[PDB]
Write a structure and sequence with these properties.
homotrimer, 248 residues, 9-stranded antiparallel beta sheet, 5-stranded antiparallel beta sheet, 18 strands, 47% strand, DNA replication (chains A, B, C), DNA_clamp_sf (chains A, B, C)
Amino acid sequence: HMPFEIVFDGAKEFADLIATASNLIDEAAFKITEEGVSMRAMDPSRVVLIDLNLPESIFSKYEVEEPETIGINMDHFKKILKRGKSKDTLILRKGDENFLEITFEGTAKRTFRLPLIDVEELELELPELPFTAKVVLLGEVLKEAIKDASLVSDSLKFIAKEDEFTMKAEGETNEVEIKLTLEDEGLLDLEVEEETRSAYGISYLADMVKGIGKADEVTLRFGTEMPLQMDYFIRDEGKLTFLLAPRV
Amino acid sequence: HMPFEIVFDGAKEFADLIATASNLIDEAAFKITEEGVSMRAMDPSRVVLIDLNLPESIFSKYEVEEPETIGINMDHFKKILKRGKSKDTLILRKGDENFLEITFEGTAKRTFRLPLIDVEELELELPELPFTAKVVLLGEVLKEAIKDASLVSDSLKFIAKEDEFTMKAEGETNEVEIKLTLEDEGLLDLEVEEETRSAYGISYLADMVKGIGKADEVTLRFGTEMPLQMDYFIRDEGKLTFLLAPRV
Amino acid sequence: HMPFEIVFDGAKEFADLIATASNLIDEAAFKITEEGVSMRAMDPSRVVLIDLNLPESIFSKYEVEEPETIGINMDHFKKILKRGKSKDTLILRKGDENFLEITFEGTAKRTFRLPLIDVEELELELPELPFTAKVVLLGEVLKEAIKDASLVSDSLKFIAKEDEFTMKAEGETNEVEIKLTLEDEGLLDLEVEEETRSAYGISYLADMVKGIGKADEVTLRFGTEMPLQMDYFIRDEGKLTFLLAPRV
């Protein structure tokens, strides 16, 4: 197999990015091409599809000789990546053997070897879906709404109308409603082709947003009784996308 | 029953205030009048009386049509109030039904409904007591003294003389003494009509001061073998008062 | 026995210093002389020798009438010292009786009495050893290397060559290497008489460095199959030294 070397400036930020996807994934195939690194995976229950796309432009050095796929234990990977410091440079390097060499370069050079595994490749595509609502909002609104709703229920209803986005949860001894209009600072954009209603499991939503930052911009696309698509951008050009089955 | 709407600027600070009283209380009757909101309660052991007085002037909007009392599960209330952010506006609103509508307004509008309960109203008054010592001190001195004493014993002796306030605890394998004179920055005022000695349970004192801030000014009034009265002010005009039975 | 009074400006910093040695020690004899305070102890397994030297110059007041030794329960001592604040002045005073009086003076005067114990005095000396490598490095490099290695193994190999210092750990499902040259900011000095290799237990190293600060300068001296000597300086003139048996 051909070697590659991939360098990212800011190892803690790369660790944070990986921890977001690792919240639902145990293992993942990473496709390394000359245009960038991509990773598509499902959670063990097949309720959530994760798609992480890291184009070559976000790496300070990108040397990939031929396309290849590597399989990675995500919790081992996250354990090593959690050792990187904010100011560290991260180097991912594969030689001829079956392991990833992970180097942090900062006040010292620290090198880990991570054994590569074989990951069964479900043939996962991200199809195009007839979404009828798009919502852009601040991560902290989304995070707090999912936490608020968890005080009440295990499912969260999303309601998009022309002028307002509403998340609503109700239980026996409680109820909670989170409402956004474009007058609110939490809602950066709202495009609604028609009145759209759908519900989603809170345990999955919490794991999806746990690593998202309070100032991150998150785009939601959904439809009536359709999956929820949730993405946010990494370093302007990278992108993390979740696709979440509806609660029906 | 008549509706009311009550608005407080700074929801996290209102949550903090409620958590202080919630440390000893499971449930409480809130008397809502046109002059403000008051709450008088005892802990389950009847050792501590709590009196919280929130005058209308600390609320940015105060619309109370007729006096009424509502009963509240304090741990449910604290759970909801803990979701408010520092910059949020808090709205407490009762309509015609038997629930409190709690709204946080900030980057988004989040609304919870809290079921109102029935709280047995012990006829609690805050009588006037012939205290012989008054002490004003910084919260952190009081907090650290109670923590220091807990390393040693389960009761804390308060000793007020004309020129010094002393808190003293002794156990078998330890002893601790905390001494204040007006020369010390921790003691803002000391008025002692006669030499005064009394002891109090540390487990109650710790729960009383847990939510008090390090820079808060706390007034203590006590007498020989008498209850301890402890109060501090909320937004200059609100007031939280504890009355604690002596250890005899 | 003769009284003494010893005053240290900055009680939290004295607590931190004591907690470093307390990580491996349960009890210790403190020799109080006119030149300063010293403490030599071994961990319960006799794998680590600890030597703490606090010269009279680091104390704002130092009144010792005649040399004497006192025995101290280190976990009781640390428990009391943890109550001191950053701005507090710490006073250690022995009168005629068999207890240490520990006073924190700040916003208030708080006084604890700590019973003195009898500590069996192993006749411990810090002999001179034919070390062949000396390494000065930033504490955070050392701390992170020991943490990195603990992901992999229970022993850490130290390798000193003329131009590089290497710490290396290997396990079955992992390996880690930390490399320093004088080009690196983590390595402040490297003196190597000959190529030196030795290994040490990670559980002991972690307890040795747990209290060391990220910006502290740490000196390591070791030899092939010899003990590791690790010291850093307290207030320029105090010194904490560990001597750690090799893993053979």
